[PDB]
C-alpha cells in the first residue's frame, strides 16, 4: 500500500484523513510519496533528566522532565513546519548535542552505528523528510535526512 511504516489515520479535530509513520513519527495530510547503504542526517536533541547523560553544552545539569522535553520538541516541529524557524537555526540554538555547532549535522552513517530508534527513523525517512519526535536513551530527537 504505502511506503515503509506509513498508515492512515483520521484527524480528531477535522475528520480529514491524514498519514502517520510509526517508525519516524511523522504525520502529514498528503499521501506519502512512492534502502541505501548509508544516509546522512541532522538532528535536534532535547535531553531530559532520564537521558543517559543528563548534561550538554547548553546546561551542566539537565533537569527537565521527559514530558517537558517532548513539549519543547513539539514546539520546534511546529515552528519548523510553519516556516517561522529553520531546522538548522533551532538545532544550532537548542540542540543538547555537540552537533549543534554543525547545525545538527551528524554526517553519513550506516546501520549498526546509531541507537536503534534513531537508525530506524533515519533510514525510513526519504531524502529531505523530517521526523516527528524520536525517542532514544539520549533524549528526544527531531531528525532531518539530508542525503
Ligand atoms: N507556540 C505558538 C502556539 O503554537 C501552537 C502550535 C500548534 C499547536 C498548538 C499550539
From Swiss-Prot:
Q: In which tissues is it expressed?
A: Expressed in immune cells in the lung (at protein level). The phosphorylated form at Ser-55 is expressed in normal breast tissue cells but not in breast cancer cells.
Q: Which residues belong to any copy of the WW domain?
A: 1-34
E.C. designation(s): 5.2.1.8
Q: Which PANTHER family match?
A: PEPTIDYL-PROLYL CIS-TRANS ISOMERASE, PEPTIDYL-PROLYL CIS-TRANS ISOMERASE-RELATED
Cross-referenced Pfam families:
Rotamase, WW
* Entry's Gene Ontology BP terms: cellular response to hypoxia; negative regulation of amyloid-beta formation; negative regulation of cell motility; negative regulation of ERK1 and ERK2 cascade; negative regulation of protein binding; negative regulation of protein catabolic process; negative regulation of SMAD protein signal transduction; negative regulation of transforming growth factor beta receptor signaling pathway
Cross-referenced InterPro entries: PPIase_dom_sf, PPIase_Pin1, PPIase_PpiC, PPIase_PpiC_CS, WW_dom, WW_dom_sf
Protein's recorded name: Peptidyl-prolyl cis-trans isomerase NIMA-interacting 1
- Compartments, as annotated in UniProt: Nucleus; Nucleus speckle; Cytoplasm
- To which species is this protein native? Homo sapiens
The consequence of residue 47 to A is: Loss of peptidyl-prolyl cis/trans isomerase activity. No effect on the interaction with IRAK3/IRAK-M. Abolishes IL33-mediated increase of IRAK3/IRAK-M protein levels
Keyword annotations for this protein, in alphabetical order, are:
Acetylation, Cell cycle, Cytoplasm, Isomerase, Nucleus, Phosphoprotein, Rotamase
Which post-translational modifications are recorded for this protein?
Answer: Phosphorylation at Ser-55 by DAPK1 results in inhibition of its catalytic activity, nuclear localization, and its ability to induce centrosome amplification, chromosome instability and cell transformation. Ser-55 is dephosphorylated upon IL33-stimulation of dendritic cells.
Amino acid at each position: 500500500k504505502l511506503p515503509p511504516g506509513w498508515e492512515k489515520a483520521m484527524s480528531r479535530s477535522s475528520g480529514r484523513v491524514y498519514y502517520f509513520n510509526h517508525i519516524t513519527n511523522a504525520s502529514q495530510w498528503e499521501r506519502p510519496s512512492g534502502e541505501p547503504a548509508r544516509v546522512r542526517c541532522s538532528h535536534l536533541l532535547v535531553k531530559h533528566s532520564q537521558s543517559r547523560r543528563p548534561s550538554s553544552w547548553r546546561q551542566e545539569k539537565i533537569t527537565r522532565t521527559k514530558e517537558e522535553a517532548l513539549e519543547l520538541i513539539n514546539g520546534y516541529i511546529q515552528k519548523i513546519k510553519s516556516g517561522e524557524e529553520d531546522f538548522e537555526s533551532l538545532a544550532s540554538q537548542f540542540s543538547d548535542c555537540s552537533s549543534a555547532k554543525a547545525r545538527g549535522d551528524l554526517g553519513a552513517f550506516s546501520r549498526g552505528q546509531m541507537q536503534k530508534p534513531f537508525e530506524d527513523a533515519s533510514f525510513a525517512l526519504r531524502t529531505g523528510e523530517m521526523s516527528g519526535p524520536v525517542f532514544t536513551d539520549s533524549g528526544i530527537h527531531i531528525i532531518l535526512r539530508t542525503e
